[PDB]
Every structure is written in C-alpha cells, then in structure tokens.
Amino acid sequence: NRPILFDIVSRGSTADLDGLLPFLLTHKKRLTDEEFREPSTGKTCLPKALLNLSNGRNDTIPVLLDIAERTGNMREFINSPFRDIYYRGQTALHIAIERRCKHYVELLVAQGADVHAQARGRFFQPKDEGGYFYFGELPLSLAACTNQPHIVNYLTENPHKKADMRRQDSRGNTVLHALVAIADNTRENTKFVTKMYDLLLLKCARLFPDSNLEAVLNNDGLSPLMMAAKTGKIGIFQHIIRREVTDEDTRHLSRKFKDWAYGPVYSSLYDLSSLDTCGEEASVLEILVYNSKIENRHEMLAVEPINELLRDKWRKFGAVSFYINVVSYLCAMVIFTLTAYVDYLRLAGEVITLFTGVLFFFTNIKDLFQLLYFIYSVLVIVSAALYLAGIEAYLAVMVFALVLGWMNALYFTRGLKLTGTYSIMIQKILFKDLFRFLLVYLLFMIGYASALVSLLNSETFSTFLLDLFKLTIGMGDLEMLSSTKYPVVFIILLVTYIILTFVLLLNMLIALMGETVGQVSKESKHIWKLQWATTILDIERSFPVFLRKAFRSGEMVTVGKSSDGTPDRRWCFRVDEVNWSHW
Amino acid sequence: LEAVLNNDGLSPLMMAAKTGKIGIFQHIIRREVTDEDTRHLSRKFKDWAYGPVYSSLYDLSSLDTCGEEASVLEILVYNSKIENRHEMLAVEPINELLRDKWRKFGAVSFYINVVSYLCAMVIFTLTAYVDYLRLAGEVITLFTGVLFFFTNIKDLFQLLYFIYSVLVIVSAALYLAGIEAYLAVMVFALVLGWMNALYFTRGLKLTGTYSIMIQKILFKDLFRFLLVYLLFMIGYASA
Amino acid sequence: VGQVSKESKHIWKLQWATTILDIERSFPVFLRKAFRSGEMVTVGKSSDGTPDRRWCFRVDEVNWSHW
Amino acid sequence: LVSLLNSETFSTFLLDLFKLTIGMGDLEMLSSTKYPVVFIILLVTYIILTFVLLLNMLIALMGET
Amino acid sequence: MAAIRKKLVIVGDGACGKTCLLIVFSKDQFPEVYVPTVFENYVADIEVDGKQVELALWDTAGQEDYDRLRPLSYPDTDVILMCFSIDSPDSLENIPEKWTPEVKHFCPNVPIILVGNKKDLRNDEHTRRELAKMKQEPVKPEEGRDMANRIGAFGYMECSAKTKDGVREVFEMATRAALQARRGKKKSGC
Numbered sequence A: 001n002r003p004i005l006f007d008i009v010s011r012g013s014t015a016d017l018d019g020l021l022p023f024l025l026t027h028k029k030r031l032t033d034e035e036f037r038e039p040s041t042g043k044t045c046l047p048k049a050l051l052n053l054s055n056g057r058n059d060t061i062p063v064l065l066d067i068a069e070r071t072g073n074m075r076e077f078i079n080s081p082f083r084d085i086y087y088r089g090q091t092a093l094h095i096a097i098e099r100r101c102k103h104y105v106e107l108l109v110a111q112g113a114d115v116h117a118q119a120r121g122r123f124f125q126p127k128d129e130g131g132y133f134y135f136g137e138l139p140l141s142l143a144a145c146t147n148q149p150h151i152v153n154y155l156t157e158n159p160h161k162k163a164d165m166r167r168q169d170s171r172g173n174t175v176l177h178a179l180v181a182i183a184d185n186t187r188e189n190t191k192f193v194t195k196m197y198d199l200l201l202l203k204c205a206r207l208f209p210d211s212n213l214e215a216v217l218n219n220d221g222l223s224p225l226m227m228a229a230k231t232g233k234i235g236i237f238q239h240i241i242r243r244e245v246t247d248e249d250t251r252h253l254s255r256k257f258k259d260w261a262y263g264p265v266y267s268s269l270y271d272l273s274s275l276d277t278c279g280e281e282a283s284v285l286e287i288l289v290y291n292s293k294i295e296n297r298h299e300m301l302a303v304e305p306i307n308e309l310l311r312d313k314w315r316k317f318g319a320v321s322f323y324i325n326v327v328s329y330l331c332a333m334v335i336f337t338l339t340a341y342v343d344y345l346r347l348a349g350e351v352i353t354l355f356t357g358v359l360f361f362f363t364n365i366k367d368l369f370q371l372l373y374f375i376y377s378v379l380v381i382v383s384a385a386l387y388l389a390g391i392e393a394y395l396a397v398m399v400f401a402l403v404l405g406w407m408n409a410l411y412f413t414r415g416l417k418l419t420g421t422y423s424i425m426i427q428k429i430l431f432k433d434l435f436r437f438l439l440v441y442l443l444f445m446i447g448y449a450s451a452l453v454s455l456l457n458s459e460t461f462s463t464f465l466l467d468l469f470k471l472t473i474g475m476g477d478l479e480m481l482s483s484t485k486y487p488v489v490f491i492i493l494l495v496t497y498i499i500l501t502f503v504l505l506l507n508m509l510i511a512l513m514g515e516t517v518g519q520v521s522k523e524s525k526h527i528w529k530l531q532w533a534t535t536i537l538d539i540e541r542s543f544p545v546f547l548r549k550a551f552r553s554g555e556m557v558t559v560g561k562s563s564d565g566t567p568d569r570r571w572c573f574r575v576d577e578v579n580w581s582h583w
Numbered sequence B: 001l002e003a004v005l006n007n008d009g010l011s012p013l014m015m016a017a018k019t020g021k022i023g024i025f026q027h028i029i030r031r032e033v034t035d036e037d038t039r040h041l042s043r044k045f046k047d048w049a050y051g052p053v054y055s056s057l058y059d060l061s062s063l064d065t066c067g068e069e070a071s072v073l074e075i076l077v078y079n080s081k082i083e084n085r086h087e088m089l090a091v092e093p094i095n096e097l098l099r100d101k102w103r104k105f106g107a108v109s110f111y112i113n114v115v116s117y118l119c120a121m122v123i124f125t126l127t128a129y130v131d132y133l134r135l136a137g138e139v140i141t142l143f144t145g146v147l148f149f150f151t152n153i154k155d156l157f158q159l160l161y162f163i164y165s166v167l168v169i170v171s172a173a174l175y176l177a178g179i180e181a182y183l184a185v186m187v188f189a190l191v192l193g194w195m196n197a198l199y200f201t202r203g204l205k206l207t208g209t210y211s212i213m214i215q216k217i218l219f220k221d222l223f224r225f226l227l228v229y230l231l232f233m234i235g236y237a238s239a
Numbered sequence C: 001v002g003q004v005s006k007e008s009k010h011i012w013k014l015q016w017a018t019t020i021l022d023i024e025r026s027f028p029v030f031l032r033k034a035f036r037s038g039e040m041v042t043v044g045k046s047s048d049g050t051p052d053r054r055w056c057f058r059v060d061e062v063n064w065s066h067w
Numbered sequence D: 001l002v003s004l005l006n007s008e009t010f011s012t013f014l015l016d017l018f019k020l021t022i023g024m025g026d027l028e029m030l031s032s033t034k035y036p037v038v039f040i041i042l043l044v045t046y047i048i049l050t051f052v053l054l055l056n057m058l059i060a061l062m063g064e065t
Numbered sequence E: 001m002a003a004i005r006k007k008l009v010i011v012g013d014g015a016c017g018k019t020c021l022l023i024v025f026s027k028d029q030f031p032e033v034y035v036p037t038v039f040e041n042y043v044a045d046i047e048v049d050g051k052q053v054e055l056a057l058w059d060t061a062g063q064e065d066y067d068r069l070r071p072l073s074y075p076d077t078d079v080i081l082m083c084f085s086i087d088s089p090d091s092l093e094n095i096p097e098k099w100t101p102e103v104k105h106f107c108p109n110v111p112i113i114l115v116g117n118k119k120d121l122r123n124d125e126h127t128r129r130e131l132a133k134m135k136q137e138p139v140k141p142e143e144g145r146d147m148a149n150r151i152g153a154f155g156y157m158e159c160s161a162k163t164k165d166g167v168r169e170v171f172e173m174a175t176r177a178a179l180q181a182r183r184g185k186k187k188s189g190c
Ligand SMILES: Nc1nc2c(ncn2[C@@H]2O[C@H](COP(=O)(O)OP(=O)(O)O)[C@@H](O)[C@H]2O)c(=O)[nH]1
Pocket: E012, E013, E014, E015, E016, E017, E018, E019, E020, E021, E035, E037, E061, E118, E120, E160, E161, E162, E163
C-alpha cells in the first residue's frame, strides 16, 4: 500500500521494490494515480525518494524511473506538480537541485523532466508576502541562487533541452533579477553573487550575441541595476556600476572604460546609460533618492560615478541657480506684504497678490513638509470670495497665510549649504520633540486651568485663562488670586504649575540634543547631501526636455567599434583619479 | 533532574535567570544534544531547512505567560535585581518572544488602556460643574476614583497613583458633611490625574524615552535640588 | 542622563516588557489561553511512545556560511 | 500686527512691542485693534517662534558649531 | 524570441470531448482504443502573431473523486475553454446554471471561449433519430451564438476531433485571448 511504498522509498532499499512492476501492470495502476499520491499535497513517490539520501546516494531512483518508463507514464511521473498552496508547483527537479545532487539533476534532465516548471506556492514568495525563500521560481534561477555553478552549466549546455536564460516568471523577473533579490550586504554573499552574475552574463552573451540580458525588464519594469538601487543591495549595485571585463568579444557589456594615462594620473570613462536626468527611462539616481526607502541610502551615494555626478551637476545649477528660486519666494513675499496697504497701480498689485498665491497653489498641485506649503495655498483661496462679499473675516485668513510665508523662508534657508543643517535641525525639533511636547502641554494646561477655576469657586474660565497667559508673560496682574475661595492652596499650586510646565519644557531641550539630535548630529553631513540632492533634482525636473538637453553632463564618446561596426556611443562622464601605487 | 526543585521552589534555569548568571542560562536555553537516547533532554530542535534559510523550534516549557508555574521571563523582569538584566533579553528565544507578544497585545491594545484613563479624566473633570444626568455623572466620578483605588490595592511610581486614590476618599465624607474644604482635596487629585497622563505616554514607543527622562530628573536631581532650595529660601527669608 | 543616554534603548525594552506583562496578567486564564504564543509540536516519539508535545515557538534564521 | 490693528502708527507699535518683549510695557496696541481675537494667539505665537528659534541656536551652537 | 508560458484549462460536462479535443491538439492522432479520463502535464508550442507561446493544458473531469480536487486547478489560470456537446442538448442549459458560477467564483476576470464539439454528429442519422425520440434537435448554431453573447464569451467556435476540423484555429484564438492582459482594474479601492 501507499504507506509501505513511502517507507520503502524512505529507506532506499531497491530490493524491497522487487515485484512492484508486476503489481502495477496487473492492477493497471500508475505511479501518478491519486491513491499513490499523498492527498494533502499531491506528493508522488519520486519527491519522497529525493528528499531522503544516504551520503547523497539513493538506489531507488533508477528503478522508479525504469518502472515509470515501463508503464508509459514517465512524462506525468516526472512533471507531476504539488497542488498545496504552501508548496504549489514544486517538481522533482526543484528537489534535486536543492539537495545538491548533480548526477540526479543530470538524470532527470535526460529523462524529459520539465526544465521551465514554475513553483508559485506561498512558501516561495518573498518575506513581505509571507514566503520564506525567493529564487525566481525557475530551476535555472534556483541553481544560480544556491551557489551551484556546475548545475547552471549543465542546465544551459545539456543536449536534450536547454533552459533559456531570458525566461521570465509570473512576476517577470529573470535570473539576474532573482540574483539581485537574494543578495545581501554581507561580504561573502556579495562575492559569490557577483561571480555568479558575471558568469551568467558572459554565458548569455556567448549564447545570445544580439540580445542583452540586462536590457530585459520585469512586469514592474525594473532592470537589475535599477532594482538593486531601489531595494538597497549595495554590493551588487556597486559591482554592476563598475563592471570591467577583459574579454574582447564581450567588451561592450562592461561599463567603466579607461581612456588614457600619463603616469600617476589616470582618467577612466564611465557609462551614464540609465543613470542620468532628462531621460525618458527611469533614472537610477532619481529612484535612489525618490522612492528608495532604503536604510543604506546614504552609503549608495559614495560610489565613484554617483558622487561626482552631483558635483558636475552642482556647477551647472547648484551653485548658480539656487539664488533665483530663493528670490522668487522673496518677491512673492513682498507682493503679499503689500496686501495690508497711484490707486490704479496699487489695485493692480493687489490683483497680483491673489495671482501670486494662486500661482503658488497651481505649482503646489502640480508637485503633488510640502503639506505646510499646501496649507498656505489652501488659505489663499477663501480671501477672494469674502473680498467679493465684503465680509470682515478675510483678514484672519490672510494673517495665517502671511505668517506661513515668512516661516516658509526657512525652507529656502535649508537649500543653502550654510543653513542646511540648522534649518533641518529646527524642523526636526519642531516635528519630533516640540510637536509632542506642545501636544501634551496643551492638555495639561487646560486641566490645570480647570483646577484653578475650581479653587476660585465658561466666561469665568475665559477670564482666568487669558489672565493666566498674561501671568506666564508676567505683564498681567494677579486678578484671579483676589477672587478665590481658597488661595492658600492655589498659591503653592500656581507656582508649582508654572514649574511643571517650564521644567518639562526645559527637559525637552535636554531630550532634543541627545535623544533626537544624537542621530542627527552623526548623519547630518549625509542628510545634507540628501537634502542637496533632492533640491538639485527638482530644478532639473522643472526644466523642459530642451532645457535639460542643454546641460546633459558628460561628453559623448565612441567607446569602440561594435559588432555591427558603428562604434558604440554611450554618453560617458569622465572621472579623473591619480594613484602612485602600482604602474 | 532539572524538574527537581529546592525548598524555595526554583529550577536550575529559573535560579540562573534570577541570580543573573548569564552564560549558564544561555547554555541551558539553547541546549542541543545529538545522542538519540537523551534527545528529549535538549530544548532547541531544528524542524526543516530549504538551503540558506533554517527554521529551528524552541521550547517554551516554563518560559511563557499564562502558566501555573512561575515563568522565567516574568521572574527575569519582576524580581531579578540583576546588573546584567539588560543582556539577558538578547538571547534568541527570549527577545523574539516579546515581539510575537507585541503583535497580539503591544501594538493593538495599548490604545484601550490609555483611553480608559482619558475617559476617567473627563469624568473627573465634570466635577467642578439635565440635573438628574449630571448627578448620575457626579456619582460616576466618585465611582471612577473608587475603581482606580480598588485596582490600585489589587496591584500592590505607583505610589503616586496610590496618593491619587488616597485623596479621592475624603471627598465623600466631607460632601455628605457639607464642609467647604473638599475642593482642596479635589484640586490635588485632579492635578495628579493630568500628571498621571505622563505614565500613559511612557508606554508608547515615541514618548517612551522622554517620559522616563522627565521622571528620572524629577526624582534624582530635581527632587534633591528642590529639597535644598526650599530650606535655603526659608533661611534667606529669615535674613 | 549620562548613564540614561547609553542605556535608554535597553531601558525602553524593559519598560515595554513590564507594560506587556501587566496586560497579560490582568486577563483571566481563558483570555490568556486564547493567545498562547507558538504552535504545539510533537517533537518526536518519546520513550513511552506518545510523542513529547512541548509548546514550541518557531524561530526563523538564515545563514549563508556553512551548509 | 499693523494690518491686524487697522509709518508713525507702525513706529508706536514697534517700540511698544519691544517693551512687550521686555514685559515692562503695557499692551497699548491690543486695545486699538480691529481684530484682536486673531492677534492674541498670533502675538503669543510670534514670541514663541522668535524665542524657540533662538533657543534652538544654543543647541545648534554647542554641537554643529 | 523567448517563449511565454500561458495556462489553459478546460471545464465541461463529461463525454463532451474535452480530453479528446486536447489529445487531438497534442499528437494530432485520434486514439481509437484508449482515452485517459484526463490529459495532464503537457505543454504545447504555438505561434500566432510573431510570438512563441508555450501553452500548458490542464484538464478537469468529474466522474469520480476528481470533482473534489477540481478547484485547485483554477488558480493562476490564463484562459478557459468552456466546452459542451453539440450532439447533446442537455449540456447547453447547465452551462449558465452550474458551470459559470464556479468559474467566476474561483477565477474571475479571465477570458472564456464557449465551444461546441463534434459538429459531425449533429447531421448523423442515429443522433438525429435519438433526439427526435424526445422531440428534441441538435444544438443549433444560433443557440450557441446567443449563448456566447449571453454569458460574455470571448469567442464561439466548433470542433471535430474525429476530422480534426477547426482545432488549430480554436486554440489559436484561445492563446490570442490569453495574451491580452485584461483591462487594469475596475472600481479599485483607494
Ligand atoms: N465519432 C466521434 N466521437 C467522438 C469525437 N470526439 C469525441 N468522441 C467520443 O466522445 C467520447 C468521450 O469523450 P471524452 O474525451 O472522454 O470527453 P471528456 O469526458 O469531457 O473528457 C469518446 O469515447 C469518443 O468516442 C468525434 O469527433 N467523433
């Protein structure tokens, strides 16, 4: 019976299988029948045999294959997938590869086993989706992921049925995508992954001269380099960016060339294909600092061709055009300041004030703490309706908005290098500590106001509250105290309340420097570059294609004669480095 | 053998946790033995592996809540008095257990306990102030204070909370009397409640450090400084 | 605060741990039993023959080093 | 603040506002205001903003500078 | 270039020729002696318009115990051939009644091709006499056309396994429909 066969397969004893074929032929049963398969997952005999091995050797496999060929169900026998959601789609070849049995992998390949079978069960998804191990759901990608080069070589060089390296799964990821996915920042992992990546790329180049594997994209539309940048896998991204290959036939696949040297000074070209602004395709630099959500983002800018690109951009826009954007808000602030205040000219400027607010809102909607700026734009609106009405409350709206504008000036300070750290520190304090401290203090103050009211024994509370604020200033006299049923208790409390409000706020400053600014102090320089980078990117985004094309960084270079014969002309950005060591 | 207990009722693992002997406790928790006959004596088993990912079981016998026997985790953070207590939580099966607990209660149920004190604060705030409904709420105010005291006595800076509960009591007797001094008692208690809100802030991750820092300053430095300053001020007043 | 600054993260976990413990203590045995962490697993056949069934909490760890 | 009150009228306000920062001077401006209700919150808010930004300077000075 | 894998599944009443229809498509040889209850784990190569597609053909039967396991063949389905028999009118009316709700329940927003098999038998004297015994007639093409529009069918064709008539075109349209990636989403949440 099925349990007996499963136990026999578990032991590995070929002798116990004797007589199986006569039984099956007499009963006209198949090894893929439901009875023999395990109902829970559809598991067949061969997976059970593969999962158990004695010193990596199981003698039942050939007999199982022989009887499966005898009955004539070998195709169904080897292609039978698991149907459980947990292990959906798994086949014998997946187990054979996972167990590092080269000879068994070769045997299964020789016996017509499907080589493009997918395993899309929930156990094979990424961590985010609840799965445990993700490798691309292909046997070739599985072999590549688990550091098994011989199996990759065999699968790609077998005579019976080769496995196209370009094959894509349901997600659209190719083998390179999976390699990027499983990589991490640990040194050994990055080393092995890089070696596997280079071997795979060269093999694909030899097999497919016309095509370029990295060009292939997934359903989401990511190239391996772009995904590596997004997900934060630093090592593989750095290796992909500085790929250099000596082989002449595959020279076009590498990125960083070396043009000339004059002794201790070298000048090496780099490749900005899919790495620069004003390009229709997504930019790696842009996605690295727009939707990265990577904890290693700060270290991703240290790469040679990445860091310098921003300085070259800095010359064009950074240091010369920040003035203009700053000045625009200064002029808008003046136009608004004229509000409170040549009647015709004054009215024209008054119209210009509403126009400037509307322009700020129009560019705000296009761009979408810009929610603060959104609040400013929101507040501008009500004034026009109430001004047409003649209502008297439009002044309050204008007050809120005006103070918001002068406060927005701080955002302009942030862009400049000198004030870049101070502005960000002020904002962080206002958001992390200051916000929570104010939130708590407001409720505490309201409750203590109620306590003071009780001691005095809505309007009676309003007078007390306003005069208590004056008391905090100290200008106001103690009118409340005189009209109190029990001042003796209140007097100590009133001093105590002031101490508690102040001392908790005094602690905030101590809390801010270490608890909140402790991490800011260390990473401020990295954050400032990020802040500078985001500001630089927005300037280029605003300019239209013609304006962007005016200042495409780097110089076009014909790296060398291509296979077609027309030299490959990447847009390259030269990098100059000198090094006395070596020759 | 490990089952055997002393007169005090401690197993070797529990005593190791209490006294702070880190190394033996870590070794006892992650004991793995290859021998088949003695396999049942070890704790951490390994169920399956699929390549570079492994999933190993652990043993929570005498290491989890809702157990009649004393919990090692509970005694490690209730009566430890160990200078290495912070390093005892780094052990693999110890640290993760709290995150698994965190999903069930930590991140979803802290709101409710916080909100209970907020509602009690509102009920009390109604004190100073539909006559029948208002009187019912007034009774609810004393009931809420009494409930806070009843749960306080059961739990025993909860001595501050005890002070709040203590102060609630006098008000009922004086309210029946009609005396005029119950207001002072209510004032003390009301300010104590709004201050207690800080304890609710402490639980949240965002305010967890700020609340504790404020308390520590109020206890270590602020307390002694105020104590000295009061006497200095009295003497200078005499001068 | 010199010692508080260094050990605040450790203290916060302790503070978090104490708060978590009190919540479970309040709930009665039935409520606690509702959310016993881990999954019951029969580790293996015991000497008696009935498999030993400890209440086990699985831990997932990956490691490239070794095989 | 001048707009809320609704050159010399600004000079009086400015000098008395400096006195207000000191606290010796009385709130003469507030009495002569078309919309004090909005101003009252703002006047406190303005003082907080001036001081808190200056308070941050001390924090900025010790570490950043 | 690089073959794209598309999953095709056939659902229909028994004895309407589903297994035979796939079999003729697979080896182009009518089995005159032995027909398995199900034809599984086969992938066929087809090119329609400049694209090479590997079509994985699943098969569902419900004679005995297969109905319990039928649902777990639906996941990750790319295209469906809902099949019925032209020489058996009883098959048609059950499609809207029972077959459609199950298909929609387990796998919605999937293309469906409603097909009627064995066009030869509608003109057969034996089948015509048998249906006339109950005052019935073979399923008219008009009824099939109306049904296809009624239940949102992608296309309606007719097959003949014995004569190998229209099989290539039917599966050609099936994969053409499969290659379309639906239309985004409808009434998606925010
Ligand atoms: N004469 C004739 N018989 C057919 C044809 N196609 C199918 N059949 C008959 O239909 C019977 C069952 O069809 P089958 O493949 O089992 O359909 P299924 O039960 O849905 O899988 C077979 O025994 C065939 O003889 C055809 O084109 N001509």
